[PDB]
Amino acid sequence: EQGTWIELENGNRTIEIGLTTAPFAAAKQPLGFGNELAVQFDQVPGEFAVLTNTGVHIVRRRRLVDIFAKALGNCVSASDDALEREVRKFINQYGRVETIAAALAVACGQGSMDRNTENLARAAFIEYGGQPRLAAESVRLSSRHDALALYLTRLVRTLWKAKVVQVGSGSDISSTIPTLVTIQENVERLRNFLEANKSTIQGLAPPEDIANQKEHQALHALQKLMESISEGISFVLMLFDERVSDIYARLDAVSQQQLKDLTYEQLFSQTPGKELAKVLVKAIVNRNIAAPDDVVTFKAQEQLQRASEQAHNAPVLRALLAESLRLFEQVAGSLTPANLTTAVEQMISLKYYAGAIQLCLTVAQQKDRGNTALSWVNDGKPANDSRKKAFDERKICYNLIHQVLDKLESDFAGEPELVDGRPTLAATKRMEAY
């Protein structure tokens, strides 16, 4: 135990003592329950109201980072080998890893001149972080690495294994909006500290060797997780900033059920999570329309969606259509069969036959500029060959062209090619298309 005596100035009798903050709990079972260290960035430190006959005194629990920061505050004016002395006290009690994790935290603005203290914490994180070594292939990473993994973990512990959303029929977010922002701000602070000291942190800059190399690899991995964590949170905040359940209602079931049991861990560090994020953003992009390649494709869908939402103004409709086609063609080579089909169908509905056909041809030519398809047909289409793919991607475009021409003769079934002498509008679209 750690203890102290508090004297509230004489003549007043204590009457009652009550908890003002939320009840402490680091875990939901006895194991892990009392770990104050794990929650010093999730939970407010415990505050206690002490009622006497003269007033209420407020008593606050002090965390590791609070003690470490104030102790460093006593080393500012003091010596050089006085810091080493003060740090060893912490090491002999909390252990090297816990101690360095505290220094990292204080360097990042956690803690109770404050600049001198933060610089001192930074200095401790550098000079006392240890180094990687091999055991008895296998390497034991530095305490500096363990400290970093420890600090990062504690920032995301509330949400890591948590489901991203809650579903009753189309609704809620598991972790509150304001807490995700703070978690994000905390992580971005950490990232910033790493970059702002890329030069002086050992293992961050590029590099006995196997030790320092695997140290360098492990630190790199941690940093990629952080930016992934930041992106992931930035993504979930974007979800609930738009009309969410509207997307959900108009989803699959595998897409609906993948989102149901999606954890933050999966979003942060697993492929199925990235894939679903892509599905979701794709949905909100093809709805406001309802990488300069992935950006343009969205604007094109937005242009085409607005065209269909019109009262038919040759100027406005033609403009939107013409531009939509302009954009799609710029990203022809990247268009997926699903996006191409929907686009063509929308253009067909707006009587933009020629335009639709021109897009399909362009897409066919861009997914195969070497004409692997022409040679594969000129060679008799040998099975087991790998130009088939190139031919298939053109056949999907050619089929869609059939649908356009089909719908054209259908839409204009019974329409005359000439009225009062000159050609109609239905005739000119037939000529323009063909």
Binding site: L204, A205, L219
Partner: protein
């Protein structure tokens, strides 16, 4: 009583400000910071910071000119006092300095506000505090394009070194990669300079940062965003129309390090910049941008990562459509 007691001049300033004679208060707060009285420098920073506020709003009876005449004077001194404070703070914590001299400095600096000449020569320039040297140039309206640029180069290199030594050591927490710390030291000036054209000349500084990003290999090799020099300046408030105007000038001259197959990276910058430009117009430029993106495409064929280039050409031709 204000003439010989700081804590009584405090009330006289409070007396005026409850009555809403704001100018008369800033008039005393400023005249008090310039005084010969025993007042700490950090208090004089408060005085000038309050004086700048009290002289920012109209007060009944006092002119607009005399109001700004006092706000400008107070603001100038506050900028200087902030340099002097940040300077002293760093000099005292500088291991390179003897503990005997540090006391001699602290007595001289920790009080009245000295001239930028005194702050630069006997202190800032000697210690090779390149960042604070630039703040002095800005605060002094220092007209010289070269020395401003030479100081920027030294500030970038010294910053890159401090960050690479740290990364080599890891040092309590994982330090940042070099360009991150370099990026921090520019942002710190950018907000603090308020983006004056003299000490922050994008015409020259952006090529320097882009050159540093190549000559020191701060790119995809270490997991960095290859377009981090563009991302830096755009987010700092530099106009899109200017950034693309500079990258245009870089892509044609082909002065080193912007030569050979490294120009593949110049086009990536141009794609990012222009892309962020059309996305900022479609959210809310002429022939010369279309002339460039098409000319940027010759570079990618002239260089023909076989799939990276191919994918990049289709990002350029996408932007050419978005502008025309």
């Amino acid at each position: 009583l204000a003439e010989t007691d700081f804590r009584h001049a405090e009330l006289l300033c409070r007396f005026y400000t409850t009555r809403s004679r704001f100018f008369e208060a800033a008039q005393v707060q400023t005249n008090l910071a310039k005084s010969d009285l025993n007042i700490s420098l950090k208090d004089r920073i408060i005085l000038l910071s309050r004086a700048k506020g009290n002289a920012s709003v109209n007060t009944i009876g006092i002119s607009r000119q005399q109001q700004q005449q006092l706000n400008h004077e107070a603001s100038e001194l506050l900028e200087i006092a902030h340099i002097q404070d940040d300077l002293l703070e760093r000099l005292v914590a500088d291991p390179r300095i003897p503990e005997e001299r540090k006391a001699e400095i602290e007595e001289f600096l920790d009080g009245p506000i000295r001239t930028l000449t005194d702050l630069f020569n006997d202190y800032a320039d000697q210690a090779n505090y390149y960042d604070l040297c630039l703040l002095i140039f800005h605060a002094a309206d220092f007209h010289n394009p070269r020395t401003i640029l030479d100081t920027w180069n030294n500030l970038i290199n010294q910053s890159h070194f401090e960050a690479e030594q740290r990364r080599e050591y890891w040092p309590i927490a994982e330090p940042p990669l070099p360009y991150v710390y370099v990026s921090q030291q520019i942002q710190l000036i950018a907000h603090r300079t308020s983006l004056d054209s003299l000490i922050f000349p994008v015409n020259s500084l952006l090529p320097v940062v882009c050159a540093y990003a190549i000559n020191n290999g701060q790119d995809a090799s270490i997991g960095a965003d290859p377009c981090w020099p563009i991302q830096l300046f755009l987010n700092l408030g530099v106009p899109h129309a200017l950034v693309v105007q500079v990258l245009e000038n870089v892509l044609d001259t082909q002065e080193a390090p912007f030569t050979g197959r490294r120009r593949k990276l110049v086009v990536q910058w141009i794609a990012m910049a222009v892309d962020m430009w059309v996305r900022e117009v479609e959210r809310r430029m002429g022939s010369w941008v279309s002339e460039l993106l098409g000319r940027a495409d010759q570079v990618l064929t002239q260089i023909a990562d076989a799939e990276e280039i191919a994918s990049l050409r289709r990002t350029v031709k996408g932007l050419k459509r978005s502008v025309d």
